[PDB]
Amino acid sequence: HHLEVLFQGPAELEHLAQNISKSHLETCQYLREELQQITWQTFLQEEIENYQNKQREVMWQLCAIKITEAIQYVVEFAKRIDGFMELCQNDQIVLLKAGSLEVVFIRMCRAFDSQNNTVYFDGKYASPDVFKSLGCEDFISFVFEFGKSLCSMHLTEDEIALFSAFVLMSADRSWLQEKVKIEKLQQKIQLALQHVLQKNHREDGILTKLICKVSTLRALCGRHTEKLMAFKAIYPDIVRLHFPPLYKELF
Ligand SMILES: CC(C)CCC[C@@H](C)[C@H]1CC[C@H]2[C@@H]3CC=C4C[C@@H](OS(=O)(=O)O)CC[C@]4(C)[C@H]3CC[C@]12C
Numbered sequence: 001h002h003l004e005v006l007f008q009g010p011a012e013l014e015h016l017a018q019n020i021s022k023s024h025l026e027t028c029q030y031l032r033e034e035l036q037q038i039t040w041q042t043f044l045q046e047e048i049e050n051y052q053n054k055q056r057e058v059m060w061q062l063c064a065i066k067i068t069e070a071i072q073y074v075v076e077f078a079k080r081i082d083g084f085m086e087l088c089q090n091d092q093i094v095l096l097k098a099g100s101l102e103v104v105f106i107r108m109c110r111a112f113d114s115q116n117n118t119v120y121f122d123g124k125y126a127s128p129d130v131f132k133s134l135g136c137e138d139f140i141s142f143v144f145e146f147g148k149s150l151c152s153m154h155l156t157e158d159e160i161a162l163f164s165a166f167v168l169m170s171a172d173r174s175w176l177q178e179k180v181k182i183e184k185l186q187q188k189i190q191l192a193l194q195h196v197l198q199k200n201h202r203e204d205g206i207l208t209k210l211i212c213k214v215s216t217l218r219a220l221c222g223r224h225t226e227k228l229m230a231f232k233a234i235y236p237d238i239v240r241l242h243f244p245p246l247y248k249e250l251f
Contacts, residue, residue, distance in 0.1 A: 010195070016082075017162060017192045023080040024161030029073050032110050032157055035120060039113040042125045051130045057238045059133035060231055066122060067104065068244040074103045074164075081165055083185045091176050097250050099168040101224060102217040105146060106164050114151035117144055139223050146220055150213065153206060162193040167214055225251060 043051070051059065078084050078096060087095075111120035118125040131140045155163070171183035197207050228251055232239045239248065 013192045013195045016188060017158060017196050019082065020165045020189070020192070021158045021161045023077055024157065024164065027073050027077040027080070028107065028110070029070065030111065030120075035111045039116070039118065039125055042116070042118055042127070043130060047124070048127070048129055052132050054133050056133055056135050057231075057235045059131070060235075061238065061242050062122070063131070063134065064243050064247050067101075068247045070104045070107070071100050071246065071250070074100045074107070077103065077164065078168060081169065083181070084169070087182070088177055091178055091182065094173050094175050095168060095170070095182075098173045098221075099170065100250060101221045102167050103164045105143070105217060105220060106150065106160060106167070108143075108147050109150040109155065110157075110160065112147040112151055114148050117148065119144070119147060136227050139227055142220055142223065146213075146216060149216075153210070155210075156196075156200060158196050159193070159200075162189060162196055163210060165189050166193055167217060170214075 054062075075096065078092075078100075084092065084095070108119060112118070113125055116125070116127075118127050120126075121130065128137075128140050128144055134140065166186060166189050169182055169186045169189060171179050171186055176182060193210075194207050197210070
């Protein structure tokens with residue numbers, strides 16, 4: 001008892017970090033180690049050309065299908081975050097519409113080869129050239145830059161998990177009813193994140209460089225929405241008849 005009281009503080013941070021870590025491990029589509037062992041499996045030049053030969057609307061549908069799969073896994077992660085399921089359906093929805101893509105881009109770092117500038121996509125590792133038919137060179141370059149920048153921090157699986165839970169439970173998304181409860185939850189997650197960050201590299205204070213990325217993610221997800229609305233103005237029926245329903249609902 002007396003010993004239990006002396007540990008209660010940090011024990012609680014460790015407990016929450018382990019909870020979130022586990023939720024992350026069990027809701028990622030692929031194992032980190034799996035992804036790292038096949039970075040050499042890049043598309044061959046012939047396959048690259050084929051993707052480049054596809055029509056704009058065709059490449060967009062494919063990417064939306066692939067992104068929707070990753071989002072499905074992020075929704076499973078959210079469900080397991082303590083507090084998320086206690087919120088009103090309305091706040092649950094607002095946090096997912098705003099954060100599900102941000103968590104995807106965070107998870108992208110586990111499936112990104114920084115030295116060669118390539119991302120795991122449709123079975124192989126893809127250079128930015130694979131996405132040329134989208135007609136979004138700037139948005140694509142921003143995505144890869146983000147991948148490179150998060151990789152350069154060599155975040156551990158537990159670090160990625162707590163950072164995912166952090167930008168997901170943000171109390172500043174517009175239209176939230178329970179700002180105070182969500183805020184108290186993010187604060188805990190953040191103390192837990194700092195706890196695990198210092199466990200590995202009290203060498204710096206990267207928590208700030210990480211929290212700095214938060215603003216970059218919002219701009220990245222903001223551009224996605226802009227590009228998508230621009231695409232939907234030209235291909236309204238492609239979006240309506242061939243885009244995945246969950247992607248439509250979210251974006
Ligand atoms: C306009 C929009 C549709 C274009 C987006 C094109 C690229 C940026 C997308 C398409 C498909 C996306 C991947 C789909 C699937 C995954 C698996 C996911 O793996 S997991 O193990 O972490 O769950 C990590 C993100 C990752 C690598 C995504 C990165 C981002 C990704 C390459």
